[PDB]
Amino acid sequence: MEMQLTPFLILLRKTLEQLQEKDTGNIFSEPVPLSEVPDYLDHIKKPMDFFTMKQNLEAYRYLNFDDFEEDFNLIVSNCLKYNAKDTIFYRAAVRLREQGGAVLRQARRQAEKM
Ligand SMILES: COc1ccccc1C(=O)Nc1cc2c(cc1N1CCCC1)n(C)c(=O)n2C
């Protein structure tokens, strides 16, 4: 149940903070702004960002590690999909994939101890 999951959610909260710290350009920490990118949903079926992941975490939407990891991976893959390779966005998503992936590998090991 939800109370039994408390330590797991504590682990996710810490992991999310570590992931969000990898957003050195501050471009993955709010939804892509549809006022400035009005075609974004034409292209991307499930937007994701670190603020939305925090909201999801606090709303009990992540009950296992895979579901959490899936949403992080969308932050990356949506950005690679929407943007051309020779963009600040694409390069930033590659950096995030690498650095965030290291965070997740360590965090998954700690989750396995639970
Ligand atoms: C606040 O963002 C903007 C303000 C003025 C003009 C343009 C933008 C803008 O394009 N923001 C933006 C585009 C993104 C994007 C993120 C942004 N924002 C998010 C907050 C600052 C930049 N990602 C991850 C993308 O893949 N795209 C295409």
Curated annotation (Swiss-Prot):
Domain of life of the organism encoding this protein: Eukaryota
Location of the Bromo domain: 3-107
Signal sequence coordinates: none
Intracellular or extracellular location(s): Nucleus; Chromosome; Cytoplasm
Entry PTM: Acetylated by KAT6A.
Tissue: High levels in testis.
Function, in words: Scaffold subunit of various histone acetyltransferase (HAT) complexes, such as the MOZ/MORF and HBO1 complexes, which have a histone H3 acetyltransferase activity. Plays a key role in HBO1 complex by directing KAT7/HBO1 specificity towards histone H3 'Lys-14' acetylation (H3K14ac). Some HAT complexes preferentially mediate histone H3 'Lys-23' (H3K23ac) acetylation. Positively regulates the transcription of RUNX1 and RUNX2.
Disease per UniProt entry: Intellectual developmental disorder with dysmorphic facies and ptosis: An autosomal dominant neurodevelopmental disorder characterized by delayed psychomotor development, intellectual disability, delayed language, and facial dysmorphisms, most notably ptosis. Additional features may include poor growth, hypotonia, and seizures.
Self-association state and partner proteins as the record states: Component of some HBO1 complex composed of KAT7/HBO1, MEAF6, ING5, and BRPF1. Component of the MOZ/MORF complex composed at least of ING5, KAT6A, KAT6B, MEAF6 and one of BRPF1, BRD1/BRPF2 and BRPF3. Interacts (via PHD-type zinc finger domains) with unmethylated histone H3 at 'Lys-4' (H3K4me0). Interacts with trimethylated 'Lys-36' of histone H3 (H3K36me3). Interacts with ING5; interaction directs BRPF1 to H4K4me3-enriched chromatin at the 5' of active genes. Interacts with KAT7.
Descriptive protein name: Peregrin
